[model samples]
Every structure is written in C-alpha cells, then in structure tokens.
Target: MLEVIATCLEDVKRIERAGGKRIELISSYTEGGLTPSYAFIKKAVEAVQIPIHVMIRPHAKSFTYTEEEIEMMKEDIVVAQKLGVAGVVLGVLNERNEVAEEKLADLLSVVDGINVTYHRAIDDIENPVEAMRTLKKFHKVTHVLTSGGQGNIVDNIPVLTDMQKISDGQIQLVVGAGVTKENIKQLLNETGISQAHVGTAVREGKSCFAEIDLNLVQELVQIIQ
Candidate 1:
C-alpha cells in the first residue's frame, strides 16, 4: 500500500509510477494522521486509478474513542465511500489494548462496499493471538497491518513470522513499521507481506516530506526479483 501522509499529488505520482498497487492516503501523519480532506480523496482517485484506501481516523491517539469521535468516523466513512474511496483503515479500541467491537462494528456498518483494513491497532490490541480469531471472524476485514503486536517489524521479525504462522488464512497480512529501502529485501525474503506501508525511512528532504520515494520503491522492487 502507498502510505500517504500529506496532501500532495506528487506522492500519488511517485508511488503510481513506481508501480504501487494501492494507496493508503491520509493527512498529517506527523500529527499521527487525521481524516483526509475531500479534495485529496477526489484528486487522488481521479489521478490514480489504483485502489486508494482512505484512513477514517479522526485524530492520532489511542483507539479508545468518545461517542462524538465515533459519530465523526461514521460520517467520514460515509462521505469518503460516497466519493469512491476504495478502502478504509480504522481501529476502535475499548482501552489501551483491546478492540472496542461496539464502536468498530458501528463504523463498519457504514463502511460497506469498501475494503476494510484492521490497521496498526492490531499491534495495539493486547492479545493478537486471541484477537487473531476475532479479526478473522470479522468477515468484512481484508487486511491486518501489524508489527508483531509490538515494536518495529525489524526488531520483531521472528514474532512477525510467528504471527504469519498463526494467522494462516485469517486475512492478508501487510507488514509495516520501519521497513525501508535498505532492509526491505531481507523483510520480503523473511516474511510474507504481499503489501507494505512505509514513510520517513525513505524521506527525501530535510524533514516533513511525506511523499513516497519512488527510487526506494524501485530498489525494493528490484530486490523482490
């Protein structure tokens, strides 16, 4: 997935030209990602035909949501889906490390017709082994993005591989968190993530450049050969 962190079409251009299969577009990941603007959603789908997964997060924080936040997320999903967003990434939790099924299920009801992804919240959930069964049972979900229920993927490769082992057929496992151009080959060779999300590790400017580095993706594709 193309991990979009800013409101820039250049990111869409770079990733699509680099052969990105999907785009997870969002706004201000520096602030831990917020609901993207309708402008970005409209322009990205127009310019990039590949599936654009819009994030439904209201603000960057723990997934334990307030009622107002829940309502806002539902609205975000409705507006984005009506606008043709290909997918939605969201995680609603009851506490620091638990899935708040009530909150999440309500949003998912409105999220019909779009691919659903259980984002980094799987890692946030305390029991992935138990959560594994829960997520797999959530038939609408298509992908589970995680870093082995802990730190970055590199530090948790073995755990990630274990997750792959335990997660057999639960859903597509998209490995993310700190995998980069330099170490992606090892990641690909060692783990089985058909899709991946990335940022910063491939940054191209002094700081705050949220665009995907096409050159790095090219290098990563080369290693995939």
Candidate 2:
C-alpha cells in the first residue's frame, strides 16, 4: 500500500483520486508534522474513503514529552478514535532515544484497536533492530515508519532489509524518506517491502509546503501497480 502525507484538504482529495490507500493527515510541516486541528481531522475523514491515519504528535521538537504533554497526546488519540480515523501515527521516546514502551501502551489504551504506526522516531533510536524487537511487543502497533536509521532510504537499504528480516513477519515495515517513482521500484525490489510512504515526491517539490501533485502521485501509483 502507498501512503502519502496529506497536509491539507487538497492533498487529501489528490491522494484519494490518485489511488492512494491510506494517508497520514498532519499539520505544521515546518516541525515535521504536528497534530492537526480536530476540525481538520474530522473533515479529512469525511472527505475520503481511504483510511486516514492522523498524526498524534502534539509538537514537532521530539517524541519525548513532558507529563502535561503526555496527557494531551492521550486526548488526541481519543479524538482520533472518536473521529473515526483508521489509525494514529506517533512515537514516544525516552531521554535515551529509545521507545517509551509504557507511554506507547498508555496511548494504545485510548483506542479500541485502530492501527498504530511507530513513526520515524524509530530512526532516532540507538539500535533500530532492537527497537523493532521492542515495538513487536505491542500488538496494537501494526507498522513502523522508518528509513532504517538513516536520513534517506537509498542509503539505509541494508538496515531496512535487516529490519524486515528481523521482523520475521511479526510487523510491517513502511519505508519512507526520498522515495519516489524513480526509485520506488529499486527500494521495494531490493528491500522486499510492499508498503512505502512518500511526501515530497508526491508533492510539487522537495519542500513540505509543496502541494500534492496528482500527476506525480499517479505516476507513482502506475509504477508500483
């Protein structure tokens, strides 16, 4: 499945029309992505048939959060469930840059059983291989969005491939960062990942502010299909 980040209403419509199966609805791309407004999330869910996995990060600085921020994270997750989002994308790490297992469990408790994607924060963990092992412990966590601990997919091929092998069918790996029609084939073919995530490639330019280019998304869909 190809999942793209929809930063606004147009991006949601474009993703739906371009044959995208899922989307990560977020806001404030300048901080990577922050939790979108509840109104926006509700509208995006109503505007499309595809599954919308809303991002749950309260801020963009880091996955680590203060006590008060943790409560907000829980509230956001509850809202996502109430709004009927198919899932939520987020990650909570401790000071050690490792998965905060307890915090993850607490957040999962908010939703009955919507998909939970351990977002790219896994890339910041000390040992990605170990992180996958830790993430697997949570059955609610259905996927991990990562670039194999590297800034880009191409450079992290080995790590990505290793993660797949290490997962051993326990969890799905959604590779992102620098993925496009030009390199999706190679990335998937080499890493054996059927699921991929893209943002800028499906947009008009490399910047997060770029609009989702339907033509670009169609090209990607065509190549993958």
Candidate 3:
C-alpha cells in the first residue's frame, strides 16, 4: 500500500483522490513530523475513507521520552482512537538507544484495539533486524516505519531486505526517508517491502512545505499497482 503523509485536510483529500491506500497524518513536517492538532486529526479522519494513522510524537528532539511525555502520548492515542483513526504512529527508546520495553508497554496498555506503527526510532538501534525481532513480540504493533537504519534508503537496501525478512509477516516495514518517485520502484523491488511511505516525494516541487501534488501521488499509485 502507498502511505502518503497528510498534514492538512487538503493533503488528505488529495491522497484519497490519487488512490493512496493509507495516510500518516502529522504536523511539523520539517521536525520529522509531530503530533497533529486535535481539530486536524478529527477533520482529517472524517475527510477520508482510507485509514489514517495519527502521529503521537510530542516532539522530534529524540525518540527517548520521559514519564510525562509517555503520559501525553497515551492521551493523544486515546484521542486519535476516539476520533476513529485506524491507528497511531509512535516509538520509544532508552538511554542505551534500545527499545524501551517498559515505556512501550506502558503506552501499549492504553492502545486497546487500534493498530500501532512503531516509528523510525528503530533506525537508531544498532541492529534493526534484531530490533524487528523484538518489536514483533508486540502484537499491537502492526508496522515499523524505518529507513533501514539511518542513511539514504537506497543505500540501505540490503539492511531493509534483512529487516523485512526478520519481520516474517509478524510486522510489516513501511519504508520511507529519501524515497523519491525516481527510485521508489527500485527500492521496492530490492527490499521486497509492500508498504512505502512518502512525504516530500509527492509534494509539489518535492518540498515538505509545498502542497501535495495529486499527479505525483497518482504516479506512485500507478507504479505500485
């Protein structure tokens, strides 16, 4: 499925009109995406037929969060779920940069029935394949969004492939970061990943600050199909 980033109602509509299967809604696109406002989340979910996963990150300084931050994220997840969002996107790391199992469990306890997409915090892990194994244990987490460890996605194609292999259907990888229309096909082919997340690639002039370009979205849909 092609999962495009939607920061506003217009972007959500454009994604649906362009045949995108899902959306990752957020704000502060330049901050690597932050939690969207309550009004935006409610309106965006109502405006689309496809699934929308609201980002639960309070800030982009780091994936490691404190007790208060985790509490805030839990509340955000509840709000998103109440608004009928399909899922929530989030992640947590510790001082050692490993998956904070305790904190993740604390967050998951409130997730209830909604799906979860473990965000790019996995990229910070030294061994993403091993991290995937760890994340797979969390049944609530259905997807892990990663650029396969940290650099250009294309350059990490092998790592992505390995991570996907480790996922083994327990969790899916939503590959993103540096993925453009020009190289998406190759990335998908090389990694054999089913879901691709796009942000600037489908925006006008390929800028995060620009509006979503329907034509670019359609092009990605056509290619994926």
Candidate 4:
C-alpha cells in the first residue's frame, strides 16, 4: 500500500485519480505534519473513497504534549470521528522518551472505534522493539508508521528488519521517510513490509510545500501495484 500524504484538497483529488490507496491528511508540511482544520477534514472525507487517516498532532514539535495539548488531541479525535474518517494518526510520549501509557489510554478512549495508527514518535523512543510491543497490545492500533528509528528507511534497513522480527506480525509496520519510486521496491523486499508512506518522494520538487504531483504518485502507485 502506498500511503500518500495530502496537503490540500487538490492533493486529495490527485491521489485518488493517480490510483493511490490511502491519504494521510495534514495541514502543514514544513513542520512535518499537523492536524488539519474541520472543513479540510470534512471535505477530504467526502472527496475520496479510499481510507483517509487524519494526523492529530496539535503542534508540530516533539511528541511530548502537555495536559491541555492532550485534551486538544482528544477533541481532534472526536472531530475525526464525527467527520466519518477511517482512522486517526497520533503519537504521545512522556518526558522520559517513552510512550505516555496513561495519556495514550485517555486518548484511545475517545477513538469511538475508528482505526488507530501510532505515528513517527515510535522512532524517537529509546527502544523501537519495546514501543512496538506496547502498541500491539492496543487492539485498535493496527499500524505504526516508522523509519526504523531514523530519518530515512534506506539508512535503517537493518533496524527495519529487526523491528519486523520483533513486531512478530503484531502491528503492521509502515516504512516511510525517503521512500521514492526508485527505492520503494527494494525497500519492500529488504524490510519484508508491504506499505510505504510518501511525502516529499511524491511531490513536484518545486518548493518546500509543493502540491502532490499526480504523475509521480501514479508511477509510485504502479510500483506498489
């Protein structure tokens, strides 16, 4: 599966037209990704038939959030639910660089039965294996988007392999960061994973926030297909 990142309404349409299977909708691209507005969420959900996983980070900094920030994330999850999304993407860590178990439980309580995907914060934790073990315990958490504890999957193939073994088929691993048309096939073979998450790899390469190029995404979709 190629999970393409959508920065705007146009990106959503382009993704579906290009044969992409999923969209990770975000508002800001320069700061990694943040939760989009209510209007954007509603419009995106209505625009596409494939699954749309909305990013729920209140701010685009570290995964460690304050109490108010956690509340904000809860509210966003609620909005995602009300908008009829397929899943919600999120991650929360404590000051100790570990999964915020209590806080995650609180946030998970509001998922309202939608799919849950723990975002890249898994890469920041001290032990990717341990983090994944804990994430698998959550029945709703069906996926964990990671780059093997690094910025790019290419540089972390060994870790990705190890993480896959540790995963034990508990949680689906999404290989992302630096995944492109040329390397996606090798990545899948190397990591033995099925999905690749694309952002800059599928962009037009004109600017920091270039719209998703349908041609590039089409080629990527063919690669995965």
* Whole-model Cα lDDT of every candidate shown, in order: 0.73, 0.87, 0.89, 0.86
lDDT string for model 4 (108-140, tens) is 988877778898898888888788877777777
**Candidate 3 residue-wise lDDT at 139:** 81
**200 in model 2: Cα distance from truth in Å?**
1.2
- Per-prediction TM-score: 0.90, 0.96, 0.98, 0.95
Q: What are the per-model numbers of colliding residue pairs?
A: 0, 0, 0, 0
lDDT (Cα, tens digit) per residue for candidate 3, span 1-225: 999999888999999998999999999888988999999999998998999999999998988898999999999999889999999999999888889999999999898888799999999987888888789888899889999988677889998899889988788788888877777888888898988999988998888789988899989888887
TM for candidate 1 is 0.90
Lowest lDDT 10-residue stretch of candidate 1: 201-210
Global local distance difference test of model 4: 0.86
lDDT of 2 at 7: 90
RMSD of each: 2.1, 1.2, 0.9, 1.4
lDDT of 1 by residue, 1-225 (tens): 434333467777777788666777878757755678888888887887778888888777678889998998889888888888888888877865777877777888787878887888778767775666677767788777777767657877766676677779678777777767766767755876556666565457614454566676666556556
The residue-level lDDT of candidate 4 at 9 comes to 93
TM-score of 2: 0.96
- Clashing residue pairs for model 3: none
